[PDB]
């Protein structure tokens, strides 16, 4: 891929913004399990009907399907079949995480985790 | 050598010829054109970032 560039231009190395995941001190808890679909870092993930991690999907169905209840936060990316490490407990920045569509406002993002050891909130 | 009775004159001996070979050599012309395209690019030696 060697071919030098001659024309002058404005050269930027990009930009970096800290991804602050934690928003609190509630003790962090992590597990790991097989993925059933492609999963990105800090994406919110359910467990599908087969018990494999799957990116969280509200309104999946008829009775709501088990993909529709969040169960953790992926700690590393993975392809289907691979094991995904993921958080099950902690306080997390609602903005750092990867969220489904229509699950936009913080009110809804919290509504997905009230019943659990995970809590999701602002950063001041 | 021929045996020849001491009285008589002796015998005359033939001798050999020559043969000749000749060769033209071959010719070789490798060359390169050295563009900035080939000089500017990095050389493994250079460090990362600021070569």
UniProtKB/TrEMBL annotation, chain A:
<dbReference type="Pfam" id="PF02924">
    <property type="entry name" value="HDPD"/>
</dbReference>
<dbReference type="InterPro" id="IPR004195">
    <property type="entry name" value="Head_decoration_D"/>
</dbReference>
<protein>
    <recommendedName>
        <fullName>Decorator protein D</fullName>
    </recommendedName>
</protein>
TrEMBL record, chain B:
<protein>
    <recommendedName>
        <fullName>Major capsid protein</fullName>
    </recommendedName>
</protein>
<comment type="subunit">
    <text>Homomultimer.</text>
</comment>
<comment type="similarity">
    <text>Belongs to the lambda phage major capsid protein family.</text>
</comment>
<comment type="function">
    <text>Assembles to form an icosahedral capsid. The assembly is primed by the interaction between capsid assembly protease and portal dodecamer, and major capsid proteins assemble cooperatively to form the procapsid with the help of capsid scaffolding protein. Major capsid protein forms hexons and pentons of the icosahedron. Viral genomic DNA is packaged into the procapsid through the portal vertex. The packaging triggers a dramatic reconfiguration of the capsid shell.</text>
</comment>
